[PDB]
Design a protein around this ligand. Structure first.
Ligand SMILES: [Zn+2]
Lengths: 79, 5
């Protein structure tokens, strides 16, 4: 399948999307961007540049790579 | 985390 958002292929562009990322979310922009996730600007809601998979309600103890892979098995980025 | 659509 196709890369859903090529504008967010750069890990640096994913990091820059984390403006006003909330304190309660616990996971950092650095970890989320490294797992292919960028910020949508809403709550703690992130999206994968590769599969377009959407993730929210991050809890302390979550790992960005694990949640991404477990919920989106079709994703080429975390496969 | 939970997925959403
Ligand atoms: Zn993905």
């Amino acid at each position: 399948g196709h890369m859903r958002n090529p504008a967010m292929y750069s890990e640096e562009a994913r990091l820059k999307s984390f403006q006003n990322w909330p304190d309660y979310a616990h996971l950092t922009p650095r970890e989320l961007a490294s797992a292919g996730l960028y910020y949508t600007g809403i709550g703690d809601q992130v999206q994968c540049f590769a599969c377009g998979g959407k993730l929210k309600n991050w809890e302390p103890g979550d790992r960005a790579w694990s949640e991404h892979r477990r919920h989106f098995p079709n994703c080429f980025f975390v496969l | 985390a939970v997925x959403f659509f």
